[PDB]
C-alpha cells in the first residue's frame, strides 16, 4: 500500500498524457464564440526532467480535429470543426 | 478521423483524470528540501462543468503514499515516505 | 409538466393595440428564453419577438419592430406582447415558446409551444 | 440573416416508404459547420413539435422513425418509414444567428 521510487520516478517522467486543455488558451484571440465543451482532452508532454537546466518538451506533434459548439451569446450556436495540437513524443532539453 | 460533439463533451466533462503534480505545490512550506521525481501522478479533478457560475470540486478524497527521494543540498540524500491527497469522486458545485 | 399557455388574443380594430400573455409552469421562465411566433391563416411560421427574462434583453423581427414590446414578469412566470398599431398583415395565431438549457446556456430552438391564440386585426 | 429554402413544397408518399426534405442556408456556410438547424412537425391547427435539435438529434419522445442530418448550407429529414399520422407541414429553422428563420414547409399528404 505505498508506491516505490522507481515506479514513481518512472510514471512521473516526462512523457505524452491525456492533459484538459481550456479551448481559449488554444484560441486566445476569440472575441466571438464561447465554447461547449471550453476544455479537450488532448495528448500533451507532462512530466519532470528533475533537472532545472532542463524541461520537458515535445519532438513530434500532430493535429487533431474536434466538433465544438460554438455559441454567438444571444445571436446562435452551431457545431464547428476545430483543430487542436497533440503531442506524440515529449523528451528532455535546455 | 473527428471526434464527435458528445464523445468530446463526454471526455471532457468534470471526472478523476490522473494528473501530474508538482510536490512543492503539495508542500509549500518546504525549505530543507529538493525532491526526486519533482511531480508525482495523482488522480485529480479535471475538466469542466460548462457553466461560468459552477467549478469541478472533489467530494470524496483519499490520501496516497509515495517514496520520494529528498535531498538536502550540498548535505546528502534519502528516501522518504510522503503522503499525497487523491480525489475519488468529482462532482460539478457553484 | 412544462406548460405554456397564451391568452389575449381576439378582434382589434386597424391601428389598435392589444397586449398578450403567456402563463408558463413546470419550470421558471427565468432558466429560458422566452419568444412568440405567429402564423398568419394558411402560410408558414414566422418568428416576432424573444426575452431573456433575467436581465429584460429584448430581440425582434423587422417587421414588428418598434410596433410590438416583449416582456417577462419572473414572479408571476408570465411573458407578454404588448402589439400596438395593428394592421391587417398582423392578424395570425400567436404562439409562445420556449428555449429551454442545456450546457449551462440557453438553446436557439423552441422546445416547448404552447396552442396559440388567434389575433384578427378588422374592422 | 440567413433566409432557409426548404424543399419539396409539397410530396405524396405511401405507408411505409421513406420520406426526404431537405433546408438550404442561403449564406454561404462550409461544410465544417453543422448543427445549426432543427426540424418540426406541425399538425392541423396544432402548435409545431420539435422533431430534431442541432443538426441531427433525435428530440425525446419523438418516434426513431425520424432523423436528420447536415452540414454547410444543406440539411435532411428522413422520415424512414411513413406512418398515416405523419400527415403533417414540416418546418426546418436556422439558429446561426439571430433572427432564428423558419423554411416555408413542406406539406406531406399520405397516398393510400
Known amino acids: 500500500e505505498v508506491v516505490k521510487f522507481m515506479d514513481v520516478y518512472q510514471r512521473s517522467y516526462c512523457h505524452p498524457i491525456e492533459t484538459l486543455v481550456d479551448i481559449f488558451q488554444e484560441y486566445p484571440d476569440e472575441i466571438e464564440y464561447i465554447f461547449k465543451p471550453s476544455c479537450v482532452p488532448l495528448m500533451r508532454c507532462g512530466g519532470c526532467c528533475n533537472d532545472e537546466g532542463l524541461e520537458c518538451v515535445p519532438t513530434e506533434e500532430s493535429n487533431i480535429t474536434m466538433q465544438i459548439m460554438r455559441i454567438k451569446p444571444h445571436q446562435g450556436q452551431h457545431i464547428g470543426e476545430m483543430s487542436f495540437l497533440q503531442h506524440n513524443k515529449c523528451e528532455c532539453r535546455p | 478521423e473527428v471526434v464527435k460533439f458528445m464523445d468530446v463533451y463526454q471526455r471532457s466533462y468534470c471526472h478523476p483524470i490522473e494528473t501530474l503534480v508538482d510536490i512543492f505545490q503539495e508542500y509549500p512550506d518546504e525549505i530543507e528540501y529538493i525532491f526526486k521525481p519533482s511531480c508525482v501522478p495523482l488522480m485529480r479533478c479535471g475538466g469542466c462543468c460548462n457553466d461560468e457560475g459552477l467549478e469541478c470540486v472533489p467530494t470524496e478524497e483519499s490520501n496516497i503514499t509515495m517514496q520520494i527521494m529528498r535531498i538536502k543540498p550540498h548535505q546528502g540524500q534519502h528516501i522518504g515516505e510522503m503522503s499525497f491527497l487523491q480525489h475519488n469522486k468529482c462532482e460539478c458545485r457553484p | 409538466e412544462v406548460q405554456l399557455v397564451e391568452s389575449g388574443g381576439g378582434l382589434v380594430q386597424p391601428g389598435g393595440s392589444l397586449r398578450l400573455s403567456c402563463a408558463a409552469s413546470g419550470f421558471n421562465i427565468k432558466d429560458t428564453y422566452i419568444h412568440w411566433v405567429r402564423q398568419a391563416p394558411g402560410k408558414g411560421l414566422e418568428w416576432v419577438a424573444r426575452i431573456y427574462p433575467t436581465n429584460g434583453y429584448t430581440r425582434y423581427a423587422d417587421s414588428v419592430k418598434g410596433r410590438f414590446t416583449i416582456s417577462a414578469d419572473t414572479s408571476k412566470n408570465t411573458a407578454y406582447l404588448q402589439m400596438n398599431s395593428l394592421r391587417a398583415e398582423d392578424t395570425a395565431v400567436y404562439y409562445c415558446?420556449?428555449?429551454?438549457?442545456?450546457?449551462?446556456?440557453?438553446?436557439?430552438?423552441?422546445?416547448?409551444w404552447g396552442q396559440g391564440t388567434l389575433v384578427t386585426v378588422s374592422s | 440573416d440567413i433566409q432557409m429554402t426548404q424543399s419539396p413544397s409539397s410530396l405524396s408518399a405511401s405507408v411505409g416508404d421513406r420520406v426526404t426534405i431537405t433546408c438550404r442556408a442561403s449564406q454561404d456556410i462550409p461544410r465544417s459547420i453543422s448543427g445549426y438547424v432543427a426540424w418540426y412537425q406541425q399538425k392541423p391547427g396544432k402548435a409545431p413539435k420539435l422533431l430534431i435539435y442541432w443538426g441531427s438529434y433525435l428530440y425525446s419522445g419523438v418516434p426513431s422513425r425520424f432523423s436528420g442530418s447536415g452540414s454547410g448550407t444543406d440539411f435532411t429529414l428522413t422520415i424512414s418509414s411513413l406512418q398515416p399520422e405523419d400527415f403533417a407541414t414540416y418546418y426546418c429553422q436556422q439558429h446561426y444567428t439571430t433572427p432564428p428563420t423558419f423554411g416555408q414547409g413542406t406539406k406531406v399528404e399520405i397516398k393510400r
Open positions: 415558446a420556449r428555449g429551454g438549457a442545456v450546457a449551462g446556456t440557453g438553446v436557439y430552438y423552441f422546445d416547448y
